[PDB]
Write an enzyme that holds these catalytic residues in place. Structure first.
Site, mmCIF file in Angstrom:
data_model
loop_
_atom_site.group_PDB
_atom_site.id
_atom_site.type_symbol
_atom_site.label_atom_id
_atom_site.label_comp_id
_atom_site.label_asym_id
_atom_site.label_seq_id
_atom_site.Cartn_x
_atom_site.Cartn_y
_atom_site.Cartn_z
ATOM 1 N N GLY A 1 0.834 -1.186 0.000
ATOM 2 C CA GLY A 1 0.000 0.000 0.000
ATOM 3 C C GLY A 1 0.868 1.233 0.000
ATOM 4 N N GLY B 1 0.409 5.970 0.041
ATOM 5 C CA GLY B 1 -0.319 7.109 0.581
ATOM 6 C C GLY B 1 0.624 8.245 0.915
ATOM 7 N N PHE C 1 1.682 9.608 3.462
ATOM 8 C CA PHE C 1 2.555 9.516 4.638
ATOM 9 C C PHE C 1 3.385 8.223 4.683
ATOM 10 C CE2 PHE C 1 -1.812 11.164 5.647
ATOM 11 C CZ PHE C 1 -1.549 12.533 5.508
ATOM 12 N N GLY C 2 3.770 7.726 3.503
ATOM 13 C CA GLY C 2 4.601 6.523 3.370
ATOM 14 C C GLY C 2 4.147 5.511 2.324
ATOM 15 N N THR C 3 5.073 4.647 1.915
ATOM 16 C CA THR C 3 4.769 3.539 1.014
ATOM 17 C C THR C 3 5.261 2.228 1.622
ATOM 18 O OG1 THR C 3 5.161 5.073 -0.840
ATOM 19 C CG2 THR C 3 4.873 2.730 -1.396
ATOM 20 N N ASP D 1 -6.388 5.929 16.996
ATOM 21 C CA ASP D 1 -7.011 5.444 15.769
ATOM 22 C C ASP D 1 -7.328 3.953 15.843
ATOM 23 O OD1 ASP D 1 -8.084 5.750 13.236
ATOM 24 O OD2 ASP D 1 -6.146 6.076 12.234
#
Ligand SMILES: Cc1ccc2c(Nc3ccc(Cl)cc3)nccc2c1Nc1ncccc1-c1ncnc2nc[nH]c12
EC number: 2.7.11.1
Length: 256
Positions: free
Chosen positions: A16, A18, A20-22, A128
């Protein structure tokens, strides 16, 4: 020390990504997962998010918290953790509709609470907690983490969902989330499935007008469990049990 020697980490398949990182499945002394900042020459804000996750992770040594293995900076910022086969609790409950027996549902809730208890003891607020952040390693051991990169509204306590200025997160807001995970386990479904409007859910949970429908919990579900869940979902922040209490309660009924 936790800095991995330069040029040892091998990146494999992409899982995945996004803002804020891979994330990749990789290699470093066997299978690992790797969270990399892909486009390098990083922002002082990305460098901070990195330093913040590494600061929290390096504090955790517990079976129910995903295993942080180390970090790297060359050629790029990376977080290495154990590799887990399996899938998230969300996937099991809501996509492939796995039907666990009751004694296993209680086991999942116990392990999650073991994990939550530990984070809180090290003064870590998860912020979260949701069934997608509860991984089922070989569909057996639970591993808490943050697997993401407002899809957590359903797990937001009224104080949180209300978008107040002063930081609303506390141990008790995590507990609320745990309560929703318990609802997910005990009813097999997501709350408020008969409302199709996101703003409307936000507004109503926030004003206390809407609350999860606790009469949907199966009959084979122990009465002391349904109680604990309602105690966890209390609209008053401080009425909600803390994690040592929750764990104690779950381990109590776990005998019957
Ligand atoms: C590489 C990496 C780095 C950090 C993670 C992380 N951070 C974190 C932050 C705070 C706290 Cl208290 C605890 C953990 N949480 C979860 C997963 C993390 C992660 N791994 C993943 N990230 C995204 C999607 C899948 C995986 C993933 N990790 C392992 N095994 C897997 N098997 C499938 N996906 C896996």
């Amino acid at each position: 020390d936790w800095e991995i020697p330069d040029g040892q980490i091998t990146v494999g398949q992409r899982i995945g990504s996004g803002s804020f990182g891979t994330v990749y499945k990789g290699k470093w002394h066997g299978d690992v997962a790797v969270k990399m900042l892909n486009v390098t020459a990083p922002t002082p804000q990305q460098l901070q998010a990195f330093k913040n996750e590494v600061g929290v992770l390096r504090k955790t040594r517990h079976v129910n918290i995903l295993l942080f293995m180390g970090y790297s900076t060359k050629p790029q910022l990376a977080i290495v953790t154990q590799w887990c086969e399996g899938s998230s609790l969300y996937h099991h409950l809501h996509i492939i509709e796995t039907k666990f027996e009751m004694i296993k549902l209680i086991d999942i809730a116990r392990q999650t609470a073991q994990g939550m208890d530990y984070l809180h003891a090290k003064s870590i607020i998860h912020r979260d907690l949701k069934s997608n952040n509860i991984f089922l390693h070989e569909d057996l051991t639970v591993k808490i983490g943050d697997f993401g990169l407002s899809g957590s509204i359903l797990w937001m306590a009224p104080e949180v969902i209300r978008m107040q200025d002063k930081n609303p997160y506390s141990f008790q807001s995590d507990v609320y989330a745990f309560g929703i995970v318990l609802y997910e386990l005990m009813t097999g479904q997501l709350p408020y499935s008969n409302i199709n409007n996101r703003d409307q859910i936000i507004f109503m949970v926030g004003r206390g007008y809407l609350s999860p429908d606790l009469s949907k919990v199966r009959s084979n579900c122990p009465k002391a469990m349904k109680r604990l869940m309602a105690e966890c979902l209390k609209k008053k922040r401080d009425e909600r049990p803390l994690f040592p209490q929750i764990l104690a309660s779950i381990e109590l009924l776990a005998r019957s």
